Symmetry: none
Subunit: 143 residues, 2 copies
């Protein structure tokens, strides 16, 4: 995540405590349970695309649900690229981004935390939350 | 909302209890707060487009931004989908139809709009998310 420290923007990777806490939330309630989706919304504020993929990728199980969520992200990326062809290399900025760039594909954590990707990481978080929301599980009776 | 009762589909309008509960959520927590977006997601399953508009319309800046985003999606939809040859079904819809404009509550609950209400619910969820700031 990006955070203000001593007045300046700094980047730090997701900490082991948050990874552990997110994993417990998923295990206890489910990946697409409404409370889990809200939880992801709260924690992922100011995450880079690399941070987001980190949390998605370390989540075990829920293969079916996770696959449906990833499928919806891919659908958004496909739609994005159709509406936004990539510009020539040395075109005047701010240069708009491809879906791969928005999703943090091939980016170092440092790169993904840079100003070039500030709007992009916000947009990717939006795509992921939209995908989760669209796969929301209706709450059912517990054991 | 559309629900199964005695094994068949039935329609009923949104009730005052749900309206009151939704209003409390928005007042107490905010229109685009993560928990409010989730709350809308829960309550709007099987809503028609008319039901969704009832909830939007009863909700007192941020609301205008959400409506603006829905309009942007409508404009994009219509560019990509010229009105079908005035032809065999299933007939694909205009953004006005998806948004439930000019539909009676009964009409909006019909099979002709079953996919459409689902798509509109998606547009609204997307609009809320895209307007989220805090």
């Amino acid at each position: 995540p990006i955070m203000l420290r001593g007045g300046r923007q700094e980047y730090e990777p997701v900490g082991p405590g948050l990874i552990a806490a997110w994993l417990k939330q998923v295990q206890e309630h489910g990946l697409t349970h409404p409370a889990t989706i809200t939880y992801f919304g709260v924690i992922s504020i100011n995450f880079t695309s690399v941070d987001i993929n980190m949390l998605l990728n370390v989540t075990p199980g829920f293969a079916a649900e996770k696959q449906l969520v990833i499928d919806k992200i891919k659908e958004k990326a496909i739609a994005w690229d159709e509406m936004h062809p990539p510009p020539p290399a040395d075109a005047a900025g701010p240069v708009p981004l491809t879906s791969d760039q928005i999703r943090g594909i091939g980016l170092s954590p440092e790169e993904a935390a840079g100003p070039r990707f500030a709007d992009a990481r916000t947009l990717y978080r939006t795509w992921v939350l939209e995908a989760l929301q669209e796969c929301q599980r209706t709450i059912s009776p517990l054991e």
